[PDB]
Write a protein that binds this ligand. Structure first.
Ligand SMILES: *[C@@H]1O[C@H](CO)[C@@H](O[C@@H]2O[C@H](CO)[C@@H](O)[C@H](O)[C@H]2NC(C)=O)[C@H](O)[C@H]1NC(C)=O
Ligand SMILES: *[C@@H]1O[C@H](CO)[C@@H](O[C@@H]2O[C@H](CO)[C@@H](O)[C@H](O)[C@H]2NC(C)=O)[C@H](O)[C@H]1NC(C)=O
Ligand SMILES: *[C@@H]1O[C@H](CO)[C@@H](O[C@@H]2O[C@H](CO)[C@@H](O)[C@H](O)[C@H]2NC(C)=O)[C@H](O)[C@H]1NC(C)=O
Ligand SMILES: *[C@@H]1O[C@H](CO)[C@@H](O)[C@H](O)[C@H]1NC(C)=O
Ligand SMILES: OC[C@@H]1[C@H](O)[C@H](O)[C@]2(O)CC[C@H]1N2
Ligand SMILES: [Ca+2]
Ligand code: NI
Length: 641
């Protein structure tokens, strides 16, 4: 089989870049507290040009205080009249990406919204101008406080759009001088956004990109008819073993070949969240042990580099792309300056399945591929070669240059299965390398945080991964013993993306912990009705946080306590009266060992030898009975795995 690569009959679509998502939700949570140099090395593998994944696009969640898959992410407006552009870690992340690549493209998209935007309903389209005001303030703050230009704004992640909202968002953007910001919709399925654009000229004018999720490499006729740029604005979401690398390799090529999609964006950027949370280890690489510094440059990093190091937003695909006779595919791109990049993939069915969708079997076998360069491409006589074999494996290895000196403008490759080749005229490719990082280590079995940081770099203490509610460093000047605490700051349920719990909760530590003693000072702010807890063996979080079981030691401001097996509190281990009121500091201790637990109030036994389910394992946790203010101090955990 010969394959003509040519440009004399014109180009295909403009290539818009490869990127990844930080957010939906708290996927970068454990990255912020990596020590140096590791934290910076990780960021280089992701964003430094001509090094690792060298990503063209960074998309981040616009935190809305709700649970959005592996945690919550804090909003810039927790309450009406509240504005704070320094919470969370997406600002930091975007700035670190821009430091390494000042041409990186930036995107924001909400998953959840603060509850007050709903005006009494869990719905963000009650007051269109109010919701658009909220979103636009985020884009303004990105520029005013971090010198970040947000390139694209989305609507509501995998949730219904409102056409009047999209029009209001455009009008509000323009009113604030943000004409440069483009709109992508609707970050869900091809429909109903695609037909809506064909039926509504005014909507068509204000939507710049149709972004679909997990499209299985195909699009639909209405989207082609729109004439809009089509993007796989969220894809991948597969474990970053070699099979995830294969999935990513295949769809990177075939999203354009099969579906006219000129950008693909992987969820997620880096797996910096506890692996036992939903969809664990589904990032382009792995960085989930800030305590140890261990990170893994997983195969998808080098699959990315085969495209990103050798294309840039603003190149064009050739019209001459397609599938290989015996399985796999090729794309080809130029920059209009005489450069050419050819990206070939032979991913086998068995080693490249994504979680969404699963493809019916297709065959891949050994084959020869002849490539002939016609048009303006006949005059090139030299190609750098980069090669990857997935499976023991060889990653992003540079082979000896290929020469086309015989004037036939033609060359031939022997392809097997699960291979990637990049043939390019660019000489700038590099398999970036840092020395290996520390070995993997479990979460420390003795761990303490007194939260005594006067000017913290991030708005929350390290390693606490909020799963409902939002927990923050808090300074109380009018108190000496508890001047620096950790406070739960939501006072009403968000407009939720997930099924957030009815109680707030932040989990920490080692999911495999089975015997443990958790201690924490707690402070209930709401008189009469308020309540807090500490917990151990918490076995589920993320979008499953409502499912979490464990051992939960609750105290309440009405003078009572409960011990439950579930966060929902449907299953009782023990309960009784306790000398507990609001607005007083108490020390809670919870001991769990084998079949039995005990609890202490101020170092005095409140209950003991209470039988609990065993075997069982899970994180330690803190939280509050509803969406209510409460403070925590002097946290300690000793645990056995
Ligand atoms: C979108 O991509 C498709 C292919 O995935 C383009 O489709 C036709 O594809 C066949 C074989 O795949 C070619 O023989 C035709 O020449 C293609 N059509 C045209 C008009 O050239 C399709 O053109 C693309 N749509 C765009 C770019 O709007
Ligand atoms: C291939 O791409 C390189 C990188 O853009 C091109 O080189 C640049 O060319 C522009 C003008 O076209 C200069 O202003 C830059 O200083 C060059 N930079 C580098 C790093 O070379 C190159 O012209 C393209 N074409 C070929 C055949 O290499
Ligand atoms: C957690 O504690 C339980 C309860 O003490 C441990 O289980 C006991 O282990 C000893 C020796 O390993 C056995 O002789 C007992 O019969 C076990 N008791 C029960 C009820 O199983 C368990 O090994 C501890 N696990 C860790 C990781 O420390
Ligand atoms: C795949 O194709 C090769 C060559 O045609 C053939 O020998 C092999 O049996 C096929 N495998 C399957 C599972 O169809
Ligand atoms: O595969 C899970 C993905 C991840 O959880 C992202 O948050 C999401 O936007 C919501 C579901 C899907 N896309
Ligand atoms: Ca303190
Ligand atoms: Ni488990």
């Amino acid at each position: 089989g010969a394959y003509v690569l040519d440009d004399s009959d014109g180009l295909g679509r403009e290539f818009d870049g490869i990127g990844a998502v930080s957010g939906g939700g708290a996927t970068s949570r454990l990255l912020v507290n990596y020590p140096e140099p590791y934290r910076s090395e990780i960021l280089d593998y992701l964003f430094k040009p001509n090094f690792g994944a060298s990503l063209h696009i960074l998309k981040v969640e616009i935190g809305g205080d709700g649970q959005t898959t592996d945690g919550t992410e804090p909003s810039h407006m927790h309450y009406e009249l509240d504005e704070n552009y320094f919470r969370g870690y997406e600002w930091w992340l975007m700035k670190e990406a821009k430091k390494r690549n000042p041409d990186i493209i930036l995107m924001g998209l909400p998953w959840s919204f603060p509850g007050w935007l709903g005006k009494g309903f869990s719905w963000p389209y009650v007051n269109l101008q109010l919701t658009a005001y909220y979103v636009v303030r985020w884009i303004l703050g990105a520029k005013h406080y971090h010198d970040l230009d947000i390139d694209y704004i989305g609507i509501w992640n995998e949730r219904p759009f409102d056409a009047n909202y999209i029009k209001e968002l455009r009008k509000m953007l323009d009113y604030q001088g943000l004409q440069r910001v483009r709109i992508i919709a609707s970050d869900n399925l091809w429909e109903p956004i695609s037909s809506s654009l064909l039926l509504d000229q005014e909507l068509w004018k204000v939507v710049d990109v149709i972004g679909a999720h997990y499209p299985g490499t195909y699009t639909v006729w209405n989207a082609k008819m729109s004439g809009k740029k089509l993007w796989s604005s969220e894809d991948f979401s597969t474990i970053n073993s070699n099979v995830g690398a294969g999935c990513w390799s295949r769809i990177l090529n075939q999203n354009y070949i099969n579906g006219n999609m000129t950008s693909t964006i992987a969820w997620n950027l880096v797996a910096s969240y506890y692996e036992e949370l939903p969809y664990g280890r589904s990032g382009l690489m792995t960085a989930q042990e800030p305590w140890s510094g261990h990170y893994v440059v997983a195969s998808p990093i080098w699959v990315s580099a085969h495209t990103t190091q050798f294309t840039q937003p603003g190149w064009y695909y050739l019209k001459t792309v397609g599938h290989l006779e015996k399985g796999g595919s090729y794309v080809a791109l130029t920059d209009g300056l005489g450069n050419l990049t050819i990206i070939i993939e032979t991913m086998s069915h068995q080693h490249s399945m994504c979680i969404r969708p699963y493809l019916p079997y297709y065959n891949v076998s050994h084959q020869l591929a002849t490539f002939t360069l016609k048009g303006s491409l006949r005059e090139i006589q030299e190609l750098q070669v980069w090669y990857t074999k997935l499976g023991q494996r060889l990653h992003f290895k540079q082979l000896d240059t290929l020469w086309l000196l015989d004037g036939s403008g033609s060359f031939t490759l022997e392809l097997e299965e699960d291979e990637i080749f990049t043939l390019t005229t660019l000489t700038t490719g590099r398999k970036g390398s840092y020395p290996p990082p520390p070995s993997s280590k479990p979460f420390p079995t003795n761990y303490k945080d007194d939260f005594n940081v006067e000017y913290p770099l991030f708005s929350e203490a390290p390693n606490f991964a909020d799963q409902t509610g939002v927990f923050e460093y808090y300074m109380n000047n009018e108190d000496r013993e508890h001047r620096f605490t950790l406070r739960q700051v939501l006072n009403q349920r968000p407009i939720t993306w997930a099924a957030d719990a009815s109680s707030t909760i932040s989990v920490i530590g080692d999911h495999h912990w089975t015997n443990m003693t958790v201690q924490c000072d707690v402070y209930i702010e709401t008189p009469r009705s308020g309540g807090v807890f500490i917990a151990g063996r918490v076995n589920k979080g993320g979008i499953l946080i409502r499912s979490a079981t464990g051992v939960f030691f609750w105290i309440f401001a009405n003078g009572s306590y409960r011990v439950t097996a579930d966060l929902g509190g449907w299953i009782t281990y023990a309960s009784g009266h306790a000398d507990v009121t609001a607005k007083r500091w108490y020390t809670l201790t919870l001991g769990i060992k084998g079949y039995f637990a005990f609890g202490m109030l101020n170092g005095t036994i409140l209950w003991k030898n209470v039988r609990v389910k065993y075997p069982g394992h899970g994180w330690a946790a803190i939280g509050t009975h509803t969406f209510e203010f409460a403070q925590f101090d002097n946290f300690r955990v000793e645990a056995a795995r």
